Design a protein around this motif. Sequence first.
Motif, PDB file in Angstrom:
ATOM      1  N   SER A 255       0.794  -1.224   0.000  1.00  0.00           N
ATOM      2  CA  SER A 255       0.000   0.000   0.000  1.00  0.00           C
ATOM      3  C   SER A 255       0.828   1.278   0.000  1.00  0.00           C
ATOM      4  O   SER A 255       1.806   1.403   0.732  1.00  0.00           O
ATOM      5  CB  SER A 255      -0.989   0.008   1.166  1.00  0.00           C
ATOM      6  OG  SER A 255      -1.977   1.004   0.972  1.00  0.00           O
ATOM      7  N   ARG A 256       0.418   2.216  -0.846  1.00  0.00           N
ATOM      8  CA  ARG A 256       0.955   3.571  -0.865  1.00  0.00           C
ATOM      9  C   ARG A 256       0.014   4.558  -0.166  1.00  0.00           C
ATOM     10  O   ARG A 256       0.231   5.767  -0.211  1.00  0.00           O
ATOM     11  CB  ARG A 256       1.221   4.010  -2.306  1.00  0.00           C
ATOM     12  CG  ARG A 256       2.685   3.958  -2.695  1.00  0.00           C
ATOM     13  CD  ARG A 256       2.925   4.383  -4.147  1.00  0.00           C
ATOM     14  NE  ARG A 256       2.396   5.713  -4.468  1.00  0.00           N
ATOM     15  CZ  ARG A 256       2.961   6.873  -4.116  1.00  0.00           C
ATOM     16  NH1 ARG A 256       4.093   6.900  -3.405  1.00  0.00           N
ATOM     17  NH2 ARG A 256       2.377   8.019  -4.470  1.00  0.00           N
ATOM     18  N   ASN A 257      -1.020   4.035   0.486  1.00  0.00           N
ATOM     19  CA  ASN A 257      -2.022   4.858   1.160  1.00  0.00           C
ATOM     20  C   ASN A 257      -1.666   5.119   2.627  1.00  0.00           C
ATOM     21  O   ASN A 257      -1.566   4.188   3.429  1.00  0.00           O
ATOM     22  CB  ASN A 257      -3.405   4.207   1.041  1.00  0.00           C
ATOM     23  CG  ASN A 257      -4.535   5.169   1.364  1.00  0.00           C
ATOM     24  OD1 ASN A 257      -5.114   5.113   2.446  1.00  0.00           O
ATOM     25  ND2 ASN A 257      -4.855   6.058   0.424  1.00  0.00           N
ATOM     26  N   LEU A 258      -1.479   6.394   2.966  1.00  0.00           N
ATOM     27  CA  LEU A 258      -1.079   6.814   4.311  1.00  0.00           C
ATOM     28  C   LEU A 258      -1.898   6.175   5.438  1.00  0.00           C
ATOM     29  O   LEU A 258      -1.329   5.669   6.413  1.00  0.00           O
ATOM     30  CB  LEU A 258      -1.133   8.337   4.420  1.00  0.00           C
ATOM     31  CG  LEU A 258      -0.338   9.001   5.549  1.00  0.00           C
ATOM     32  CD1 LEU A 258       1.158   8.792   5.369  1.00  0.00           C
ATOM     33  CD2 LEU A 258      -0.663  10.489   5.619  1.00  0.00           C
ATOM     34  N   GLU A 259      -3.222   6.165   5.282  1.00  0.00           N
ATOM     35  CA  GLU A 259      -4.142   5.708   6.333  1.00  0.00           C
ATOM     36  C   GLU A 259      -4.169   4.195   6.550  1.00  0.00           C
ATOM     37  O   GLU A 259      -4.667   3.716   7.577  1.00  0.00           O
ATOM     38  CB  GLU A 259      -5.558   6.226   6.057  1.00  0.00           C
ATOM     39  CG  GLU A 259      -5.637   7.739   5.854  1.00  0.00           C
ATOM     40  CD  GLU A 259      -5.193   8.521   7.079  1.00  0.00           C
ATOM     41  OE1 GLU A 259      -5.724   8.246   8.181  1.00  0.00           O
ATOM     42  OE2 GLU A 259      -4.321   9.412   6.935  1.00  0.00           O
ATOM     43  N   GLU A 260      -3.641   3.450   5.586  1.00  0.00           N
ATOM     44  CA  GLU A 260      -3.677   1.988   5.633  1.00  0.00           C
ATOM     45  C   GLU A 260      -2.399   1.424   6.231  1.00  0.00           C
ATOM     46  O   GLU A 260      -2.393   0.331   6.820  1.00  0.00           O
ATOM     47  CB  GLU A 260      -3.867   1.418   4.234  1.00  0.00           C
ATOM     48  CG  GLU A 260      -5.142   1.877   3.538  1.00  0.00           C
ATOM     49  CD  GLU A 260      -5.441   1.078   2.289  1.00  0.00           C
ATOM     50  OE1 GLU A 260      -4.486   0.572   1.649  1.00  0.00           O
ATOM     51  OE2 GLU A 260      -6.638   0.961   1.946  1.00  0.00           O
ATOM     52  N   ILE A 261      -1.320   2.185   6.057  1.00  0.00           N
ATOM     53  CA  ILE A 261      -0.016   1.856   6.614  1.00  0.00           C
ATOM     54  C   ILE A 261       0.027   2.164   8.108  1.00  0.00           C
ATOM     55  O   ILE A 261       0.566   1.382   8.873  1.00  0.00           O
ATOM     56  CB  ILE A 261       1.107   2.595   5.844  1.00  0.00           C
ATOM     57  CG1 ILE A 261       1.018   2.255   4.339  1.00  0.00           C
ATOM     58  CG2 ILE A 261       2.481   2.253   6.421  1.00  0.00           C
ATOM     59  CD1 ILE A 261       1.630   3.299   3.401  1.00  0.00           C
TER      60      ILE A 261
END
Length: 341
Positions: A255-261
């Motif tokens: 993931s490149r998604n801030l909220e998922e990391i």
Amino acid sequence: GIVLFVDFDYFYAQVEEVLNPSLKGKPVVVCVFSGRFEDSGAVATANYEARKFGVKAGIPIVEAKKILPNAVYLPMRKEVYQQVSSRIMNLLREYSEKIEIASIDEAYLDISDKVRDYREAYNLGLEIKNKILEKEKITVTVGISKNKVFAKIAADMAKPNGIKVIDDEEVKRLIRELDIADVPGIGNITAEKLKKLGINKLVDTLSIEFDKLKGMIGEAKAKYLISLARDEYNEPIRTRVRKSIGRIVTMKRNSRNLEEIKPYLFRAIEESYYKLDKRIPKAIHVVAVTEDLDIVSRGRTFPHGISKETAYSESVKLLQKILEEDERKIRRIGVRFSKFI
DNA sequence: GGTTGGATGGTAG
DNA sequence: CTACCATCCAACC
Ligand SMILES: [Ca+2]
Ligand SMILES: [Ca+2]
């Protein structure tokens, strides 16, 4: 003048055999399950029943299980292992205060103050072996010699539940006849890099120029193996201070998604602070392993200690910087703490 | 030579 | 795999 080194035999797999006697004389495989799919992860340790057939530390679980269905695969328990380990190092402390704990299953004792020669050393080594087996029920290997490296090597020679003295004339025949592969601190990456050039035994390092050896395997290793091949190694049994405590965890998808990391990152911070325990790091680093197993770090040093919430807030910014600088999806995420006070 | 920044690389359980 | 360290290529006091 005399060193006594102790190595816990197949340590992780052994505690398991002691805690759970339903397992002994059988192949027992201690694993790290990454968390992704089924069999996701790697072997961390394996008893000698599992090792004879190539199931050993490092290999993946899906290769261990295809090389041996059959066996007993077990989730790692570092807390349980560390508990036993702390107790054993406490026994060892009573035989000499000059002790180098090199790892959860290795220690070095300088006994040049307690014995007169190797004969008195062997007696003491059996004694230590016997107390440990009685108090904890753990078989250990003891190596004895004149510097640390030759004490460890002696243990490597005797390994499963053994004791071995490498005296002075035996040390000299070892320099000429021991492979570079079997040298503590020299792995298979270095050994085989030197292997290509005909550098097979320890004595061969004295047949080659220092910049040629340096330009091949680096500074420390170059001076290290050269010392040893001359017999100029005898560095002291020094206490070991941990430089850094950090945690890394694997996501279930890139993931490149801030909220998922964030959830994984925050889960790393919690477990990392657990491990610090009363220690207070002045510096912190976020480590991300990307799509194609490429490593990217951003960190920051402070003129003060880092509080648990400061890490949360700072670690988020170090993850941002990575994401603006690197357009690849991240596969694992974690934090590291260092520069303690 | 020292701190501090970031990069793959290596050793070990 | 995870943990921890080293090596090197860099800016600058
Ligand atoms: Ca060991
Ligand atoms: Ca440097």
